[PDB]
A = this chain, B = another copy of it.
Amino acid sequence: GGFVLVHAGAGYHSESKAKEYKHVCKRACQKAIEKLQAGALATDAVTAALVELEDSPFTNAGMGSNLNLLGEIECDASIMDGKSLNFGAVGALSGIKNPVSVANRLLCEGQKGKLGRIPPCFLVGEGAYRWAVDHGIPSCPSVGAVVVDHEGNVAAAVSSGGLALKHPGRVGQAALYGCGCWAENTGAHNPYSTAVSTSGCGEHLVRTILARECSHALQAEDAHQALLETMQNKFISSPFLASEDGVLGGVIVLRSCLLVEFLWSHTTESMCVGYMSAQDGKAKTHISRLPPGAVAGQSVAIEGGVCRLE
């Protein structure tokens, strides 16, 4: 029981790398489902999806991340569990094969409470790396996902290698809380359990805290129209980005109340996505492209559909 929606390559359309993203999206979804069926939690699932997404030599995450000004590699990643509302994130991490794994570890450790001080929800540089190792994590000698288990718990994660030639020590939206992803269950204030993951120009997603912002909007009755409004009002026309010459970014979203509504939206020419139900078998991949004539970073594309989980 469960559902998964992932993304990769939310940027500019290439009549080439298309077939790859589809392939990595196909398995990323499956690994996730494998876990959901096998019984794992929303977080273990999403993590596995991102482990697969990062491992694709074609994604700018984990192995294959772009290189900073000094040719060195630095990864950003974060994850959030909707049931407990905990968050794990790493920034400018190097030497680890799966940065998301370190964020997930930080999250899990963080759920053990002060078992003997308040746990760290975000580490960076050498520190993140040392903590990772100090916890038995594979040391090497933008992609994201959303999930909902049989119980109804949503979760999300995101992983990226950052901008190319970015100055050393530059952290983007995949490490920043409320920006890269957001996972939050139902509550006396939230009618729906929502999960979000972002991609694109990290600076545009941060200045606007898009993830959190999408989750709050998606509390409205019309999911499709809530997201649309967010991508336009709070993103494309956001006062906080008025000094920009184009607003680039994309997001995937999941909303379960067990009814599951899933959507994706971008202001980039394209974004590849894949999804699959656990009571569905065989994944589904799609390349989302902006309407003809619509200018990249000036308009919005958005699609999605419902999916009942029995």
Enumerate chain B residues within 8 angstroms of A87, measured Cβ to Cβ: 207
Q: A169 touches which one: B121, B126, B188 (CB < 8 A)?
A: B126
Rounded to whole angstroms, the CA-CA distance of A177 and B242 in the bound complex is 18
* Known contacts A209-B212, A212-B209; A125/B92 CB under 8 A: yes
For chain A, the bracket of interface size reads: 35 or more
A259 within 8 A of partner (CB): no
* Segment at the B interface, from A9-17, A137-145, A160-168: A160-168
Interchain CB contact under 8 A, B167 and A120: yes
CA distance A15 to B124 in the complex (A): 36
Docked-complex contact A113 and B243, CB < 8 angstroms: yes
Residues in B whose Cβ lies below 8 Å from that of A126: 92, 125-126, 168-169
**Most chain B CB within a 10 A radius of its CB, from A85, A188, A189:** A85
In the assembled complex, which residues on chain B have CB atoms less than 8 Å from the CB atom of A38? none
Q: Does A201 contact B (CB under 8 A)?
A: yes
In the complex, which residues of chain B have a beta carbon less than 8 angstroms from the beta carbon of A189? 239
A85 touches B245 (CB 8 A): no
| Chain A, range 151-180, C-beta contacts under 8 Å to B | 163, 165-171, 176-179
Given A113-B243, A177-B206, A212-B209: A171 in contact with B84 (beta carbons within 8 A): no
| A131 pairs with B178, CB closer than 8 A | no
Do A125 and B125 touch across chains, with their CB atoms under 8 A apart?
yes
